[PDB]
């Protein structure tokens, strides 16, 4: 009796469980590196640190490409900007220029710590008004980090109540929603198989994103001055200026649409990533009062109430620094990073990988590898401290919250500063507790282009100790 012709085979059910976890689980059958073919496209998935470091660092430039996706084309205005731009002159220029911009913010009025703290100060005054109430803290945090990224990009901020903030939240949620159903990694290309309105809806939100950023950049052409380079748009316009002095080869690279998309990548990631990690952290603290208590003891013992926290306090608030590390481990913002692509014929783990092959680093697998981590599925900030609680250790080499190599995160410094000061200022002022109905946040998460957490509410109360210290 005969066996059936097989025209197709997938290792696991699509749209069942988080992709990143399905790939991980599948290593128990197939090892830390395996591929899948979808028509002509081949994708390689890699779930061990050594192989990952090879893809990101040792052979970084071989695999520094980005695959093309119909969805990422719309958000990137056809692979302009930085994150979804393929390897090439454009990407290199803008990545470098965006990196150069952050370097500015080391000193003076536009020192990064002082910018963040001004916005955190507002946030906390605002949250304090909700004393005794249970709220979703998303929008307040969104506002705070949006003003920061706006300052970095434009040296402008939004006034309290500016309806533009709401317009931005709307299109951000709309784009993230339609950019991918779940993660960026789709085994089956569902959107090209059945009738649907995904690209239409995505274009609509991006169009509002673009029109908005266009007015800002239009208006700023009147304000640009070559003797005043203090933000990212300055930096970018200076480059276009210097290029056109017949025009340089960088001239094509810096059209207004190029500048716009890069600003968009930076504006989008400056809000969505950090707002998200803040929510995750609070979520984990609601689930672990014992950790949360010790963060209060720590921040009262090393900072007290004479003054507000400072970047300098990273020295003493070690458990807080450890807590942040652990969230970035347990719930990485990008658990499969952003997809990479083989720029040339190369190899991983001595296996052949052809030009154009998509390569995906399963960061989730690295952070949950049993042989590299003690009880990986547990929230344990202590793992990032020595047993004495006196300083910060790196307990595993299988840890890359911010990527590495040519495509590593360019916003890490900003991220780490925002994350640490937001959590420090909040913990100094507020008791952050479970709402009156007793609902805890689901820690499962919602994987999109970023690893989001479901909306949830936190009962916020002004601390006794903070109050008593106002005299
Ligand atoms: C909690 C905060 C953040 C985390 C954990 C994080 C982590 C990451 C990761 C894992 C990647 C992918 C690396 C790869 O594809 O190989 C990435 C890329 C990137 N990040 Fe972030 N990031 C964070 C915040 C930010 C912020 C605040 C910015 C602000 C500008 C930013 C800008 C970017 C950009 C532009 C890329 C694309 C790099 C490229 O394609 O060259 N990120 N980040
Ligand atoms: C999709 C978007 C959010 C909504 C809107 O603003 C449009 C933007 C367009 C750019 C996107 C952005 C989402 C985070 C991204 C993908 C990101 C990132 C991700 C995870 C960790 N570090 C950086 C680099 C580019 C960023």
Rounded-to-integer distance, Cα 312 and Cα 308, Å: 11
| Segment (H or E) for 208 | helix 198-220
Mutate to test the pocket of ligand 2, among 272, 335, 448 (most ligand atoms within 8 A of CB): 272
Rounded-to-integer distance, Cα 329 and Cα 228, Å: 40
* Alpha-carbon torsion, ordered 166, 170, 172, 176, to 10 deg: 160
| Segment (H or E) for 323 | helix 318-330
- Give the CB-side neighbour count of residue 86, counting CA atoms within 13 A: 12
Give the residue whose CA is nearest to atom 40 of ligand 1.
83
Rounded-to-integer distance, Cα 184 and Cα 297, Å: 41
According to DSSP H, which parts of 155-197 are helical? 163-179
Least distant ligand from the CA of 183: 2
Rounded-to-integer distance, Cα 105 and Cα 359, Å: 34
DSSP for 9-26, written as a single string? --SS-TTSS-HHHHHHHT
> SS3 breakdown of the chain: % helix, strand, coil, rounded to 5?
50, 10, 40
Domain carrying residue 148: 1-471
Residue 27 φ/ψ, nearest 5 degrees:
-70, -25
Bridge partners (DSSP) of residue 352 are: 347
Q: Residue 20 in contact with residue 362, Cβ under 8 Å?
A: yes
**Which ligand 1 atom is nearest residue 363's CA?**
10
Q: What CATH code is carried by the domain that includes residue 395?
A: 1.10.630.10
Is 22 annotated as contributing to ligand binding?
no
Instruction: Look at residue 35 and give its three-state secondary structure.
Output: strand
CA 175 to ligand 2 center in whole angstroms: 10
Domain count of the chain? 1
- Give the CB-side neighbour count of residue 444, counting CA atoms within 13 A: 5
**Which ligand 1 atom is nearest residue 405's CA?**
16
Q: Residue 383 in contact with residue 368, Cβ under 8 Å?
A: no
Indicate the burial class of 236 (C-beta count within 10 angstroms; 0-12, 13-18, 19 or more).
Answer: buried
Q: Residue 403 in contact with residue 95, Cβ under 8 Å?
A: no
Instruction: Return left, alpha or beta for 31; rule: phi > 0 is left, psi -120 to 50 is alpha, else beta.
Output: left
Is 172 annotated as contributing to ligand binding?
yes
Strand spans (E) along 47-135: 133-135
Rounded-to-integer distance, Cα 72 and Cα 338, Å: 11
Tokens of 419: 């994350």
Of 319, 361, 317, nearest to 338 by C-alpha is: 361
Identify how the structure was determined: X-ray
Tokens of 196: 């649907």
Report the sign of the C-alpha dihedral through residues 9, 11, 13, 15, in that order.
negative
């Amino acid at each position: 009796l005969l066996s059936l012709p097989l025209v197709g085979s997938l290792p696991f059910l699509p749209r069942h469980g988080h992709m990143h976890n399905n790939f991980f689980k599948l290593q128990k059958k197939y090892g830390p590196i395996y591929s899948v073919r979808m028509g002509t496209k081949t994708t390689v998935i890699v779930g061990h640190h050594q192989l990952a470091k090879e893809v990101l660092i040792k052979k970084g430039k071989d695999f520094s490409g980005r695959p093309q996706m119909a969805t990422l084309d719309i958000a990137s205005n056809n692979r302009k900007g930085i994150a979804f731009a393929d390897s090439g002159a454009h990407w290199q220029l803008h990545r470098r220029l965006a990196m150069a911009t952050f370097a500015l913010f080391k000193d003076g009025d536009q020192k990064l710590e002082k910018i963040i703290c001004q916005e955190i100060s507002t946030l906390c005054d605002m949250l304090a008004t909700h004393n005794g109430q249970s709220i979703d803290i998303s929008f307040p945090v969104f506002v705070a980090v949006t003003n920061v990224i706006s300052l970095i990009c434009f040296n402008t901020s939004y006034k309290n109540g500016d309806p533009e903030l709401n317009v931005i939240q709307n299109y951000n949620e709309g784009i993230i929603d339609n950019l991918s159903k779940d993660s960026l990694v789709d085994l089956v290309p569902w959107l090209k198989i059945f009738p649907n309105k995904t690209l239409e809806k995505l274009k609509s939100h991006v169009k509002i994103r673009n029109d908005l950023l266009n007015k800002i950049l239009e208006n700023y052409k009147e304000k640009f001055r070559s003797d005043s380079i203090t933000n990212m748009l300055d930096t970018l316009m200076q480059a276009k200026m210097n290029s056109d002095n017949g025009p340089d080869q960088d001239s094509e690279l810096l059209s207004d649409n190029h500048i716009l998309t890069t600003i968009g990548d930076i504006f989008g990631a400056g809000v969505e990533t950090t707002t998200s990690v803040v929510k995750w952290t609070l979520a984990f603290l609601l689930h672990n009062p014992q950790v949360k208590k010790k963060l209060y003891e720590e921040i009262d013992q090393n900072v007290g109430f004479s003054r507000t926290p400072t970047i300098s306090d990273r020295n003493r608030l070690l458990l807080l620094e450890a807590t942040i590390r652990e969230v970035l481990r347990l719930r990485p913002v990008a658990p499969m990073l952003i997809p990479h692509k083989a720029n040339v014929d190369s190899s991983i783990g001595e296996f052949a990988v052809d030009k154009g092959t998509e390569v995906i680093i399963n960061l989730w697998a690295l952070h949950h590898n049993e042989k590299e981590w003690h009880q990986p599925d547990q929230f344990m900030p202590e793992r990032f401290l020595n047993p004495a609680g006196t300083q910060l250790i790196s307990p595993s080499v299988s840890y890359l919250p911010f990527g590495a190599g040519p495509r590593s995160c360019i916003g890490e410094i900003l991220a780490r500063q925002e994350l640490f000061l937001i959590m420090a200022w909040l913990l100094q002022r507020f008791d952050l507790e479970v709402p009156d109905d007793g609902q805890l946040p689901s820690l499962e998460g919602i994987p999109k282009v970023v690893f989001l957490i479901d909306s949830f509410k936190v009962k916020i109360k002004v601390r006794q100790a903070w109050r008593e210290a106002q005299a």
